[PDB]
Amino acid sequence: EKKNLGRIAQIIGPVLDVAFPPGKMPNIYNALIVKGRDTAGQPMNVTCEVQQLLGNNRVRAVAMSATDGLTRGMEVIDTGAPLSVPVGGATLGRIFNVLGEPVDNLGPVDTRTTSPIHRSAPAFTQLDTKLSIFETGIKVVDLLAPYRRGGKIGLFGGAGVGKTVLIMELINNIAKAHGGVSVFGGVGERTREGNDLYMEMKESGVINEQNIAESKVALVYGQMNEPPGARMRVGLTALTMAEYFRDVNEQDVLLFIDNIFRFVQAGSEVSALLGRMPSAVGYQPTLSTEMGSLQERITSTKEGSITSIQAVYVPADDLTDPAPATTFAHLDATTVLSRGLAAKGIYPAVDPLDSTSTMLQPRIVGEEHYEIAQRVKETLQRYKELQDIIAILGLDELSEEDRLTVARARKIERFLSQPFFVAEVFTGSPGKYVGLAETIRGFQLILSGELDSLPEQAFYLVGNIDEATAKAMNLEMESKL
Amino acid sequence: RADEISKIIRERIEGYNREVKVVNTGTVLQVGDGIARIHGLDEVMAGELVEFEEGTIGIALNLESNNVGVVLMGDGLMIQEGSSVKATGRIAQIPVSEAYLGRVINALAKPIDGRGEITASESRLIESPAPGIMSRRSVYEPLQTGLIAIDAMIPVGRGQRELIIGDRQTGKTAVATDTILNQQGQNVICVYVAIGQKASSVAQVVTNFQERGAMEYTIVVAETADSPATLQYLAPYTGAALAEYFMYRERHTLIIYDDLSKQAQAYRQMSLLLRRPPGREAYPGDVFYLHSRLLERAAKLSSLLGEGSMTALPIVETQAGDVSAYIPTNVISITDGQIFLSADLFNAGIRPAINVGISVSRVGSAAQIKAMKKVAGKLKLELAQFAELEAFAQFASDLDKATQNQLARGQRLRELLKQPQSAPLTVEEQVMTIYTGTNGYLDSLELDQVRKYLVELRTYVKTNKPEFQEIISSTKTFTEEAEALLKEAIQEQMERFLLQ
Amino acid sequence: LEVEAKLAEGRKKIEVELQEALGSLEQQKEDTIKSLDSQISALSDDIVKKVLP
Amino acid sequence: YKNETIQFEQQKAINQVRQRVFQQALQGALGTLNSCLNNELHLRTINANIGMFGAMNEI
Amino acid sequence: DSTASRYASALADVADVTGTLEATNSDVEKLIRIFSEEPVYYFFANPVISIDNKRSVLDEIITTSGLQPHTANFINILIDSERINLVKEILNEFEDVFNKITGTEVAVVTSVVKLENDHLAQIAKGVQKITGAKNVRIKTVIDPSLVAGFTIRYGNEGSKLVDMSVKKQLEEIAAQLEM
Ligand SMILES: Nc1ncnc2c1ncn2[C@@H]1O[C@H](COP(=O)(O)OP(=O)(O)OP(=O)(O)O)[C@@H](O)[C@H]1O
Numbered sequence A: 001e002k003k004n005l006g007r008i009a010q011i012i013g014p015v016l017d018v019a020f021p022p023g024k025m026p027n028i029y030n031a032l033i034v035k036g037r038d039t040a041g042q043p044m045n046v047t048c049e050v051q052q053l054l055g056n057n058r059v060r061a062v063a064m065s066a067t068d069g070l071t072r073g074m075e076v077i078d079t080g081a082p083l084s085v086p087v088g089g090a091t092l093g094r095i096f097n098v099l100g101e102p103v104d105n106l107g108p109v110d111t112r113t114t115s116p117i118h119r120s121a122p123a124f125t126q127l128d129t130k131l132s133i134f135e136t137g138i139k140v141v142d143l144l145a146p147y148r149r150g151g152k153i154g155l156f157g158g159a160g161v162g163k164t165v166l167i168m169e170l171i172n173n174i175a176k177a178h179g180g181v182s183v184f185g186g187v188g189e190r191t192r193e194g195n196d197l198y199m200e201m202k203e204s205g206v207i208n209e210q211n212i213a214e215s216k217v218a219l220v221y222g223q224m225n226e227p228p229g230a231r232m233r234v235g236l237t238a239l240t241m242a243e244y245f246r247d248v249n250e251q252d253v254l255l256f257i258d259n260i261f262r263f264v265q266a267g268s269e270v271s272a273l274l275g276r277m278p279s280a281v282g283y284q285p286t287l288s289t290e291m292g293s294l295q296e297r298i299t300s301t302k303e304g305s306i307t308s309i310q311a312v313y314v315p316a317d318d319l320t321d322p323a324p325a326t327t328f329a330h331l332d333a334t335t336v337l338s339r340g341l342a343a344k345g346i347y348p349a350v351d352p353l354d355s356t357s358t359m360l361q362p363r364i365v366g367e368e369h370y371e372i373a374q375r376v377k378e379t380l381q382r383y384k385e386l387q388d389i390i391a392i393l394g395l396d397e398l399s400e401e402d403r404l405t406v407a408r409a410r411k412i413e414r415f416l417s418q419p420f421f422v423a424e425v426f427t428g429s430p431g432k433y434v435g436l437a438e439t440i441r442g443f444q445l446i447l448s449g450e451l452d453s454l455p456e457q458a459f460y461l462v463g464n465i466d467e468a469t470a471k472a473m474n475l476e477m478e479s480k481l
Numbered sequence B: 001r002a003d004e005i006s007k008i009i010r011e012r013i014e015g016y017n018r019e020v021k022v023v024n025t026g027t028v029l030q031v032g033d034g035i036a037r038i039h040g041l042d043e044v045m046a047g048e049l050v051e052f053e054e055g056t057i058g059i060a061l062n063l064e065s066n067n068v069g070v071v072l073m074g075d076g077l078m079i080q081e082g083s084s085v086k087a088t089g090r091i092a093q094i095p096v097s098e099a100y101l102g103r104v105i106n107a108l109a110k111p112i113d114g115r116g117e118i119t120a121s122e123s124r125l126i127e128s129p130a131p132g133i134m135s136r137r138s139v140y141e142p143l144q145t146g147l148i149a150i151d152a153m154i155p156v157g158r159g160q161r162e163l164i165i166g167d168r169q170t171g172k173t174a175v176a177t178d179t180i181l182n183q184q185g186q187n188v189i190c191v192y193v194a195i196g197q198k199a200s201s202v203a204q205v206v207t208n209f210q211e212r213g214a215m216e217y218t219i220v221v222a223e224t225a226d227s228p229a230t231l232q233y234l235a236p237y238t239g240a241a242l243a244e245y246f247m248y249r250e251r252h253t254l255i256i257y258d259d260l261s262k263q264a265q266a267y268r269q270m271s272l273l274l275r276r277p278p279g280r281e282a283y284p285g286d287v288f289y290l291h292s293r294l295l296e297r298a299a300k301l302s303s304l305l306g307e308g309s310m311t312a313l314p315i316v317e318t319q320a321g322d323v324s325a326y327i328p329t330n331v332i333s334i335t336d337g338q339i340f341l342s343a344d345l346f347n348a349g350i351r352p353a354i355n356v357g358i359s360v361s362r363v364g365s366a367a368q369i370k371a372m373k374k375v376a377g378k379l380k381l382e383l384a385q386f387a388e389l390e391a392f393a394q395f396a397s398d399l400d401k402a403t404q405n406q407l408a409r410g411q412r413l414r415e416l417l418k419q420p421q422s423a424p425l426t427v428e429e430q431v432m433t434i435y436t437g438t439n440g441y442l443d444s445l446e447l448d449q450v451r452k453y454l455v456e457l458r459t460y461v462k463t464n465k466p467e468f469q470e471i472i473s474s475t476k477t478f479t480e481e482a483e484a485l486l487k488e489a490i491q492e493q494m495e496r497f498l499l500q
Numbered sequence C: 001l002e003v004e005a006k007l008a009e010g011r012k013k014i015e016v017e018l019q020e021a022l023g024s025l026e027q028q029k030e031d032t033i034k035s036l037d038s039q040i041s042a043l044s045d046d047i048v049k050k051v052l053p
Numbered sequence D: 001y002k003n004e005t006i007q008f009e010q011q012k013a014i015n016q017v018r019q020r021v022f023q024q025a026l027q028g029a030l031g032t033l034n035s036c037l038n039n040e041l042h043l044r045t046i047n048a049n050i051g052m053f054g055a056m057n058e059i
Numbered sequence E: 001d002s003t004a005s006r007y008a009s010a011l012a013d014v015a016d017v018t019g020t021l022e023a024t025n026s027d028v029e030k031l032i033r034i035f036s037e038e039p040v041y042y043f044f045a046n047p048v049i050s051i052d053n054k055r056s057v058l059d060e061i062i063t064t065s066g067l068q069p070h071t072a073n074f075i076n077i078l079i080d081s082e083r084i085n086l087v088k089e090i091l092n093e094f095e096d097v098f099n100k101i102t103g104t105e106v107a108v109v110t111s112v113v114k115l116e117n118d119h120l121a122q123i124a125k126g127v128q129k130i131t132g133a134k135n136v137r138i139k140t141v142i143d144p145s146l147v148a149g150f151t152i153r154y155g156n157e158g159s160k161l162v163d164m165s166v167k168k169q170l171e172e173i174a175a176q177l178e179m
């Protein structure tokens, strides 16, 4: 912020030690740019963050960029603030690194508003105590695994199932249905996958490239090519960009994180570099606090609400490992994405039974919604148990209640499909938004015997059960003709 | 031959115009275990090559408050404890040119085959940054690995980084070598990085390359297991720098890192010797950064930077199949897909012992030609049904006829995914093989006849019906005319093979 | 069998094709070094005149 | 390949000849430097390097 | 830093705050040889020897050598906190911090013969211009290990260097090896 000039004292990997004047040294969690020198013949600066005060006019930092080509005695500039990133509508439809610099080569972003990424959570008085239901407009998610406004949601689908199409549909739906915006934070983003995602966001209309700032998303990218300091703090950069849209603009923000396991992984890496003693399975000793200081700023204040949808990786496929076990202390709901359902064409490929939610309670969603969701779960579970018997006996050698159960279950399983606004670009179907009220009114009709004289391919890939009856009448006109 | 020495000594005595420059200097404090802590270089930068008094050259890695611990790219035997280290101000470059094709080199891009010297005029840094988001494209071009099981189930694209992960002695080097041999027709500059291998193993690999004729487009970077840890740490980066030169000059390349875990072990050794804080399995905190900085260099450029690409094919050895180990989890998180190998499948006859059900490819069908997808869908579905019904094989007698059909189709589709070492199928041959198998023009043969019949059929079609090869190659689709020609050739070879 | 005999023939050819050129080159470089020993004393002087002004 | 190998032996033999020639030349050069009058030789060359070191201070 | 650095800088700072820098330089060059000659260094070492039997003879050495009292206070504190085993390292590291505070960069000129001092003052001018040093205390050694001329190591210990006695023929060897 002033002439507080430091000099590098140690360079051991991406961890630096800086020496300072005897009275003026930065606080912990304070940015400092290293006025370094590239060997090619130009100057280039490196941003670091103070982690520890070491004694006689000496701190220890962690570089957000690489430390190759740095000498001892380079001028380190204290900045008096944490890492400051640009915020506001100027960060929309653009790609940012951990430092808030644009990396999409569209040009510069105007730092008219800069917030720090290190900030305390909202106060206990400023928190909202209401249990609202975030409505995504997707039938399966709204009915069987409801979302919470101000809560966190874990994506557990592997590679190849409809994950990216799902988050693009969530972005488009929070932009078109509510007045909300979205902030994608890529923790450990593979660079070619980052480019593919940015291209598909340009193409799906989410990132309006013909006119930026009409877009519905802000991209922050902490890549694998980057040191463990950047990959750890990129989630905080994304959360700050989302918290501006909550606080100042009073929107319903949607904060997408990539694998929150790589957040924990970068944290354990920086703790191993700083030399602290490892925790239980080798994680950082500040595991739960490092996770909570992030997850507690994803809340709902009196102004807006940030809802986070974090992809979760389970190492060695167990939920008792400390990174899944400490992530699951913050998840309010869970959607698993099915390889089998993606195969048989039930996009969105959300597993209906393995997706859970703590919002699905009578007190929160109404006794009607709870009872119909439980009845749908029972129907699908009975069909899953009965598939082997139908493979052996057949539908005829069953009983009548079991046969009507099987038919209603096939219709329900095909009704959990949906044509997406963002998947339309290769599928062609115009894409539908289905609120929760039409979802439960359609499932009441498909579950009680009011719509049983219909084909199974009439409920498939529609929304809004009136469209199912209309497509059924058209599929019957195909027969009359 | 008597005046050439006089002319060259006049030339080299007058070329140097008596230049003076300030140099950073330091004195050795303690040398041991390939590390030399040296006092004095207070202006050296991290990663910079420093030359010792006796001719050894080292890399300044950690710059402490008192001394500069350097790692030696050699044996520090003649270091003196008092000798003067002179910094050079350069950061680990290699000379690079198109004259490396047909050569084998070590981690300094110098010949070890003793066939002269590579006249290289340009230069490139060993640790050069990766292509950003805007200098990339989407991977669409196919990389033919010649193995039908990989090309149909786990397809590899140009610019993808695919992990050949497996156990010890399951066929990882065989898969990489089959790919490099298969790259003969396509103009792909292949690079093979032998990290910590036995020297006679690399000799066998390079003699196989020269015999098959794949040495004319290949460069072999070999740093055997007697090398210092710094050279085994630097070898994949020199490989990537050479392949990056060829990539940025609008060419398509392919680089194979043989046992990236060996590089991880070399880096662990030097990091522990530099008294750095260890982590899990005594690996340093930035071994993920090590592998990611290297693998992220494998890009498909952006069609304004030249459309060239570099396909990384790293190899990682698991121990007891413990994929939850530290380095395998790192490289799996970093790479695009994985190609798992199994000792159970390997000893059970199926070679190459690809585990298709657990191998992934995050690029997917975009890495195939239009001809391959049509047969690949049916092959994938039928192989999935066989994987489902594999438990019912002992009770195949007491089953439905459809189930027996799916079981027999599965156990004779498994027979066409077998291959012998160093015999890579072209894309037309594997298109015709997958088509025959997945339709069922070998549903009547016995299991000890499928491989022989397919060999005879492939040779017959390649010899007699070249319209099929031309329509599969020029149009890159499975045309109806190709279907008809293949059915005719199947019937003809079926008669000729029923003749026995 | 006959291409193994040709594989053996290659070795009989390589021994002569290398060792004769090798003997020529050895004796040539030896003659050239002992010939220059009368002249290197004079050829040292230009280096002296180069280093000292 | 084997002809390339012979050519490599050629070039390495050229190099070893140049090496031993220059070693004998360094012996002869220190020999002729032993005869020069050290006082005037230093008064000359140290001042030459003084001008060169001033140039170095500029660059 | 080090214990030597953190004690030497402390003594140089309490010598700057009450200007005695020449008196403390004379004091430390006296104490360097007073704590050389290993009987006395061993005696102030050898922790079996009591601190009172140390302090008595130490105050005697104070009275005889007529040292400044604050340097005597420094040695008393080195007896108090058991850092007297590093008194050699502290005293040898005092010179670098004294030259840092007093604006001097010390720069050897290792040449074969004695110089005529006009070009030596020229080297002094060059080393002081190129570093910003106010008054360089140039030193030389008569060392015939060189070939022709001179060379100067300046900077922190010897970090920077320009070499013209042998580096010419060294570059000639580097040309002839051609690798
Ligand atoms: N497709 C194949 N057909 C027949 N034999 C094969 C095949 N693939 C590998 N082999 C045989 O398996 C053995 C080991 O092969 P390879 O060296 O590729 O395995 P590896 O995993 O590289 O071994 P290591 O673990 O020692 O590195 C070799 O003898 C090779 O001949």
Ligand SMILES: Nc1ncnc2c1ncn2[C@@H]1O[C@H](COP(=O)(O)OP(=O)(O)O)[C@@H](O)[C@H]1O
Residues within 6 Å of the ligand: A158, A159, A160, A161, A162, A163, A164, A165, A166, A347, A348, A418, A419, A420, A423, A426, A427, B362
């Ligand atoms: N609602 C949908 N309708 C039609 N196709 C879909 C739908 N959702 C996903 N898909 C298809 O499934 C594939 C899923 O790929 P994607 O989710 O982008 O992979 P990843 O999860 O690795 O990003 C896409 O190629 C897409 O074409």
